[PDB]
Amino acid sequence: AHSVKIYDTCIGCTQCVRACPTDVLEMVPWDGCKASQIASAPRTEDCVGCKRCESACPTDFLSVRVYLGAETTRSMGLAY
Amino acid sequence: GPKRGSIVKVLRRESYWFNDTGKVVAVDQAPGVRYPVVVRFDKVNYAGVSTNNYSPDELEAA
Amino acid sequence: KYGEKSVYFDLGEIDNTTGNWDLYGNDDPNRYNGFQNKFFETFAGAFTKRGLLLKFLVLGGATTIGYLGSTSSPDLLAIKNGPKQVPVMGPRGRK
Amino acid sequence: TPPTLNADTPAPIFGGSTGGLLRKAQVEEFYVITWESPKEQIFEMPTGGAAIMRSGPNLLKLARKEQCLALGARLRTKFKIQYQFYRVFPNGEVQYLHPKDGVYPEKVNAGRSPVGVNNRSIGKNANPAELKFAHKQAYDL
Amino acid sequence: EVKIMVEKDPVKTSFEKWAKPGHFSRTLAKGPNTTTWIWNLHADAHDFDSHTNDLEEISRKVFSAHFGQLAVIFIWLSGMYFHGARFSNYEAWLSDPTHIKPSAQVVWPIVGQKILNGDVGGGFQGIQITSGFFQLWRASGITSELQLYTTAIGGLIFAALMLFAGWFHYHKAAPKLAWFQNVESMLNHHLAGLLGLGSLAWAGHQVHVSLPINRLLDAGVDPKEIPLPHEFILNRDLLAQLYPSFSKGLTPFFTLNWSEYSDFLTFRGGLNPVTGGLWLTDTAHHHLAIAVLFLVAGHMYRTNFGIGHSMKEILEAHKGPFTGEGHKGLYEILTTSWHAQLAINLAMLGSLTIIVAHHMYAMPPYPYLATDYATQLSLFTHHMWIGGFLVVGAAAHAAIFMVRDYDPTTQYNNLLDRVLRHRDAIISHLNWVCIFLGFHSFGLYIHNDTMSALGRPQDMFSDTAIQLQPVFAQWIQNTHALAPSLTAPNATASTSLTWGGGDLVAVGGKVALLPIPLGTADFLVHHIHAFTIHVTVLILLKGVLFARSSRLIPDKANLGFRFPCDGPGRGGTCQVSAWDHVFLGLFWMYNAISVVIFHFSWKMQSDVWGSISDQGVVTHITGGNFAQSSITINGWLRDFLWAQASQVIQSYGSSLSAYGLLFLGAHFVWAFSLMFLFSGRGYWQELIESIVWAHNKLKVAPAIQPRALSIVQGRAVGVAHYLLGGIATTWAFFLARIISVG
Amino acid sequence: MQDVKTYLSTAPVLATLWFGFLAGLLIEINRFFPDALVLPL
Amino acid sequence: MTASYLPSIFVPLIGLVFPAITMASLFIYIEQDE
Amino acid sequence: EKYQVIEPLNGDPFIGGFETPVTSSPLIAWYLSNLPAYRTAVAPLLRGVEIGLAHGYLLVGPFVLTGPLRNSAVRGEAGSLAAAGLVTILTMCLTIYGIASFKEGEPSKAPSLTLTGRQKDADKLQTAEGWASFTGGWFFGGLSGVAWAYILLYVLNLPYPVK
Ligand SMILES: CCCCCCCCCCCCCCCC(=O)OC[C@H](COP(=O)(O)OC[C@@H](O)CO)OC(=O)CCCCCCCCCCCCCCC
Ligand SMILES: CCCCCCCCCCCCO[C@H]1O[C@H](CO)[C@@H](O[C@H]2O[C@H](CO)[C@@H](O)[C@H](O)[C@H]2O)[C@H](O)[C@H]1O
Numbered sequence A: 001a002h003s004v005k006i007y008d009t010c011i012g013c014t015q016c017v018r019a020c021p022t023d024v025l026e027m028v029p030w031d032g033c034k035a036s037q038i039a040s041a042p043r044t045e046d047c048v049g050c051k052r053c054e055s056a057c058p059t060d061f062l063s064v065r066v067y068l069g070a071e072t073t074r075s076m077g078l079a080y
Numbered sequence B: 001g002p003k004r005g006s007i008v009k010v011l012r013r014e015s016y017w018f019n020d021t022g023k024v025v026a027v028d029q030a031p032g033v034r035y036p037v038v039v040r041f042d043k044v045n046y047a048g049v050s051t052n053n054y055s056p057d058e059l060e061a062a
Numbered sequence C: 001k002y003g004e005k006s007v008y009f010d011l012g013e014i015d016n017t018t019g020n021w022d023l024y025g026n027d028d029p030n031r032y033n034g035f036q037n038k039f040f041e042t043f044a045g046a047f048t049k050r051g052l053l054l055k056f057l058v059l060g061g062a063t064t065i066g067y068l069g070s071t072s073s074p075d076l077l078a079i080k081n082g083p084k085q086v087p088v089m090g091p092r093g094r095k
Numbered sequence D: 001t002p003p004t005l006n007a008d009t010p011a012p013i014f015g016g017s018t019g020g021l022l023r024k025a026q027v028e029e030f031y032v033i034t035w036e037s038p039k040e041q042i043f044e045m046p047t048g049g050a051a052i053m054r055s056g057p058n059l060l061k062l063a064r065k066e067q068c069l070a071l072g073a074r075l076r077t078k079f080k081i082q083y084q085f086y087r088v089f090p091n092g093e094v095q096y097l098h099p100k101d102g103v104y105p106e107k108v109n110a111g112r113s114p115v116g117v118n119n120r121s122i123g124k125n126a127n128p129a130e131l132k133f134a135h136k137q138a139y140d141l
Numbered sequence E: 001e002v003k004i005m006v007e008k009d010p011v012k013t014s015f016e017k018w019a020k021p022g023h024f025s026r027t028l029a030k031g032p033n034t035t036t037w038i039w040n041l042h043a044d045a046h047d048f049d050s051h052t053n054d055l056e057e058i059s060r061k062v063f064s065a066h067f068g069q070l071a072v073i074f075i076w077l078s079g080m081y082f083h084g085a086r087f088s089n090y091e092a093w094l095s096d097p098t099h100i101k102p103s104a105q106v107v108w109p110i111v112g113q114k115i116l117n118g119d120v121g122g123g124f125q126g127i128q129i130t131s132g133f134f135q136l137w138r139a140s141g142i143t144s145e146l147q148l149y150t151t152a153i154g155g156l157i158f159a160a161l162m163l164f165a166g167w168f169h170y171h172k173a174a175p176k177l178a179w180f181q182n183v184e185s186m187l188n189h190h191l192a193g194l195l196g197l198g199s200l201a202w203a204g205h206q207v208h209v210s211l212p213i214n215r216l217l218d219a220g221v222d223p224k225e226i227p228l229p230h231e232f233i234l235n236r237d238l239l240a241q242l243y244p245s246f247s248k249g250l251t252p253f254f255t256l257n258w259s260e261y262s263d264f265l266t267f268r269g270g271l272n273p274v275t276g277g278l279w280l281t282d283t284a285h286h287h288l289a290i291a292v293l294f295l296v297a298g299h300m301y302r303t304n305f306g307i308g309h310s311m312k313e314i315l316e317a318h319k320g321p322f323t324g325e326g327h328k329g330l331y332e333i334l335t336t337s338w339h340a341q342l343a344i345n346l347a348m349l350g351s352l353t354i355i356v357a358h359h360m361y362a363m364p365p366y367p368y369l370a371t372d373y374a375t376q377l378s379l380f381t382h383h384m385w386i387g388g389f390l391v392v393g394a395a396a397h398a399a400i401f402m403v404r405d406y407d408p409t410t411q412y413n414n415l416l417d418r419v420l421r422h423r424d425a426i427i428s429h430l431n432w433v434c435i436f437l438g439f440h441s442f443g444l445y446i447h448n449d450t451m452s453a454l455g456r457p458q459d460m461f462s463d464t465a466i467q468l469q470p471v472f473a474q475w476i477q478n479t480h481a482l483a484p485s486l487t488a489p490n491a492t493a494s495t496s497l498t499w500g501g502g503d504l505v506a507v508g509g510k511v512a513l514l515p516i517p518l519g520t521a522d523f524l525v526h527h528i529h530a531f532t533i534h535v536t537v538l539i540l541l542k543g544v545l546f547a548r549s550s551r552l553i554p555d556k557a558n559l560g561f562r563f564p565c566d567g568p569g570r571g572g573t574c575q576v577s578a579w580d581h582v583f584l585g586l587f588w589m590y591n592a593i594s595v596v597i598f599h600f601s602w603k604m605q606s607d608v609w610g611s612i613s614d615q616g617v618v619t620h621i622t623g624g625n626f627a628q629s630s631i632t633i634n635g636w637l638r639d640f641l642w643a644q645a646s647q648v649i650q651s652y653g654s655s656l657s658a659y660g661l662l663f664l665g666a667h668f669v670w671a672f673s674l675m676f677l678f679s680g681r682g683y684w685q686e687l688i689e690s691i692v693w694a695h696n697k698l699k700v701a702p703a704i705q706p707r708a709l710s711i712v713q714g715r716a717v718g719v720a721h722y723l724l725g726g727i728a729t730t731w732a733f734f735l736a737r738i739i740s741v742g
Numbered sequence F: 001m002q003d004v005k006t007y008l009s010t011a012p013v014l015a016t017l018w019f020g021f022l023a024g025l026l027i028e029i030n031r032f033f034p035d036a037l038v039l040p041l
Numbered sequence G: 001m002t003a004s005y006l007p008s009i010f011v012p013l014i015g016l017v018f019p020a021i022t023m024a025s026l027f028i029y030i031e032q033d034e
Numbered sequence H: 001e002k003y004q005v006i007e008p009l010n011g012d013p014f015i016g017g018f019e020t021p022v023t024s025s026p027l028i029a030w031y032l033s034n035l036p037a038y039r040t041a042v043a044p045l046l047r048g049v050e051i052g053l054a055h056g057y058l059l060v061g062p063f064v065l066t067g068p069l070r071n072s073a074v075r076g077e078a079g080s081l082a083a084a085g086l087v088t089i090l091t092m093c094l095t096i097y098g099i100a101s102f103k104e105g106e107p108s109k110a111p112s113l114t115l116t117g118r119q120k121d122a123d124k125l126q127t128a129e130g131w132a133s134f135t136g137g138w139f140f141g142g143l144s145g146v147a148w149a150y151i152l153l154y155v156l157n158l159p160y161p162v163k
């Protein structure tokens, strides 16, 4: 049960959403950036914690943050 | 915000270029943009980029 | 696994779909002799209960181990036999 | 959009593997991915090996959501093929999951509400000492 | 079909790219921003297939680089020959092989280095060498420094020729891709010419030069009085005096009266009693037979002339009911990817090098080599280490092929796909084998230790206690010892003296070879070897098979061959790449080879090597303590490492002091590697941040931003310094001990 | 020839030349002034 | 050694019976659902 | 050339596993189906009795031929006691496993579907009462097998090649 937060420094380049291997993130209409869109994390129950989204974020410091927490059979990535 | 071609100092505390000088590239004049100033630097950060967006109150006139 | 065609997914047969089969399970009821079953159900049936089995196992193991340890003959265990040679002096004459 | 249902569509031509389903699928969820192909092609199974996809509808059982999404990403970026996948529970419940509103997540779509968005920079979060003996985490504020 | 196809002037010869450090890469060419650029530049230099996408340029670069390595090898050989011609006591050694220590390196007097110039004999001072070049030169028939100087000059000329050939075939006349893919013609030409003609030429040299000169040397003729090699060619009367069958000319050869040449083409086992080496007449008949066999084998594959086999059809024909499509599709893989060929060749070359080490100690081919214990130990250990490294590289580059050049479209139901489809069973059964071997061997050692400590030696797995005899190896030894009577009747003696049957060969009061008994300790140590080898194979095979995907990471092939991790998620995914599997296989290969060389050293010193006196009584170096003291870990620690390291730690103030210095330095480097192995990158990056602040405070910060070494670079540096330290420690220990007591 | 001069100014080549000259100087000094433990001046 | 037979009872007890009971109890305790 | 032996498990390519001569074979399948463990319709007590008898009988030899007292005059008794102690420890392990795995209300966990798709009654071994009965039977049978092996080896002479 990891937690993913998006901060208002996002520019809406959509790289984090493309990088997510489990479809946790998605783009949402917004006002506050030139692209006029921001990222959201509705399916945080499916997050595995790989932190590819953080690696894909261009910003001084990250606009998307992953805070590791309770481990579950989906978070542990178990096929058995 | 600062005019194009200005030299500004970053004051964002979590920024990689804190207390370092920049080079203003473009300022967005839309009313609702939260970080409209675009600043380009000389050295790349850990992620390898050299451009960032800052608020007008996170830059110094020098 | 409906099985009619290359279809292997079927919500009607979810045990076939998930592959929940019994590979070697055999359900023939006749294996042993009747009197064998009578004798074994009469005698071996006492240990069926599990809490009583735990208590009996623990008490019996403790009793057996203690009795064997405290009554073992010296000719079997060297620790009970004890030393049989004169002790050796230390380096600086320290015993 | 109205989420689609499931049916009895043929599976790809695969000869078997040891990377298939296990007891987890029996006593927990397992995933099914569906797509349509214009011609028979050879593709790499996410579980290892090569399979042939049929002409028309295809259906594939997989053990993890990551496997389904990796196969779908390869299908989209290499064969130009649209795909769906679901989640199946042991009792028969089916949950439609990937194109939740019919639009892929990297495209902005109306009717979506933000979740987890904080209206500040990452440097404005509070101190762990301020929220002492409280259940907050300083990023939930 | 098969023809010469080249391109004229493909690449212009200029120094412009020498001033562009990262020209070969499109990302490195832009110049550096951080210190990572330097490491990336020196790391991607010779990885040709990552720069371009067309096989033609890759093939041309590979051809020219192989020319360059050949030139380097020629320079090395010329250097060895010259340094033996000018800075050696080879002639004095020729006079008295059993008392003069070989020496070919001399140090200058500068800072006290004088002490390294030892008293090797022959009125000479220098470093004693263990490469065995003196024995090889004596077997070749060289009796003067002029011949060695001529060979050195020829080697330099050949190095220049190889350099010119590399320049020519890259910058002037580059072959096309269709030229490199003539695998049938390549196998025909190499297998016939390079092997058969080379063996025939060496057999000719042996017959016409080496046999008479070594015959005279073994007789007792002074080296200065022996006629020069051309005098046996211009005057056949001398060669007929030594071997009378030369007086018949080549008539018996063409009339098929080959039995006339039986006095210099013999089939006799054992060793020469005078020199303790193999008879050179057997070496003549065997390089000749090898030449004939290879020349016959090289006329097999189809080419422009119709006749011959076609490899594609052969591969497509052998398939059965258990394996689907069988060997179909392998021809395109092996004619399309350089990495698959590299993997196969590395595996075969490493295995061959290990076989060379075994066969060379068991049947010493050079005169006065068996009784030079330092040379035997050095050669065995060296070529064994080389073979281990090559077999690890095989797995590395096979995994590279699997990640990069694998194509699922071509491989549908052939052997590769079906291997990739039952990999879990393979890895599970191999895991069970590794655990079983480890338990039932190392637990036997620990059981022996515990019984010995408890004062119950009657409960041990020893020869006097409960026995574990190697009955199969004993039977094989007995069978091979009785061959010259039943199954190889034309042989005079057995293949080697190590088999149970035979006698003792002594040269100059030292044992050359001797029957090697096998007991409980040998059983234990070979089953240890089996354990370590199956474990190394497990690691490397798991790395190769799971290189593209697994259950944990379904898309591992997108991340590449060499990546650090995939984040702390899924519990943690550190070292999921095939590169890290090679990284661990290197450690386990080190473990295995170290145990192997320790077994060889102790067994030889304890049961074979020794001094023999009058009445034929043999005294061994360690007095036969291997059988009793090697069944315990404490036995190893006390009677091998503690006992035999007395020479290296007492070598200060003598000519062997460099060995002690390097012993200490190698322990140091091995310890130093642990700080790269045990730590992570973030700590060092933050420490570098503080140090960069310190340099910034004085306006002296560098323009290229300092960065901590990458994760993969940290692992590579750790493993490299670790291997160097361990191997150098063993090197110094072995050389000091065996030079002192040998 | 300009490209050759630029190549000869690279860090490894210059380091090799500089350290070779320094090592030669130290070796010659120790050849002519050996076993120097304390500075006489 | 006033007794000299007590170790022959206590050492086997603490060494075999005590670990068995405590490991069984702990295994039952951790393998619960409550 | 199209004949092939290896087949996906029960014809489903997407279930982990293969169906090989080792896995499926009339001799191997018959032998595995006629072992007491897979006799799902037989009472667990008698299956446990047979399994315990076999294991207790096989355990006697290793403890007697190899052991601290193997060269003494009480080797057989010591080995038999050691085998009985091992049987007791394994009975304790079975009891605690059954306690930790099964509750008194769960119907059963064994698969109720044959390979040919037939529906059959699930095995009663995978239940609290079934496991308890199987454990009691295993204990009694193991003790009986150890006693029988000891009697045959030493109470009666019965010469053996190694003994
Ligand atoms: C002995 C073994 C071989 C050693 C190397 C031999 C190199 C021979 C020439 C190779 C380049 C051939 C193509 C020329 C053309 C080329 O390279 O680029 C062409 C380029 C032309 O420059 P220019 O300024 O003359 O012309 C620019 C045009 O735009 C208008 O003219 O440079 C040259 O002509 C320089 C040629 C020599 C460059 C190397 C000089 C130094 C070489 C030797 C270094 C070591 C000296 C040691 C002395 C002890
Ligand atoms: C591939 C070939 C490489 C080597 C090329 C050069 C080969 C030179 C050796 C071939 C000559 C063989 O020499 C062999 O026959 C010669 C006659 O033919 C003999 O020569 C003998 O008879 C000659 C007349 O025919 C006299 O001039 C000689 O004085 C006399 O020695 C040699 O005593 C004998 O050794």
Ligand SMILES: CC1=C(C/C=C(\C)CCC[C@H](C)CCC[C@H](C)CCCC(C)C)C(=O)c2ccccc2C1=O
Pocket (backbone or CB within 6 Å): E675, E676, E677, E679, E680, E681, E684, E685, E707, E708, E709, E710, E711, E713, E714, E715, F015
């Ligand atoms: C020590 C260590 C470092 C720190 C080491 C560094 C930064 C390497 C330094 C290499 C040398 C010393 C740099 C030399 C720079 C110039 C070449 C100097 C030129 C001037 C003269 C000295 C020639 C890591 O970065 C690291 C990363 C990942 C895992 C483990 C570790 C690790 O253990």
Ligand code: SF4
Pocket (backbone or CB within 6 Å): A004, A019, A020, A021, A022, A023, A024, A025, A046, A047, A048, A049, A050, A051, A052, A053, A054, A066, E569
């Ligand atoms: S950590 Fe991985 S799974 Fe979680 S949101 Fe980021 S990319 Fe997606």
Ligand code: SF4
Pocket (backbone or CB within 6 Å): E564, E565, E566, E567, E568, E572, E573, E574, E575, E711
């Ligand atoms: S510890 Fe290092 S290697 Fe492991 S997941 Fe974290 S960053 Fe990757």
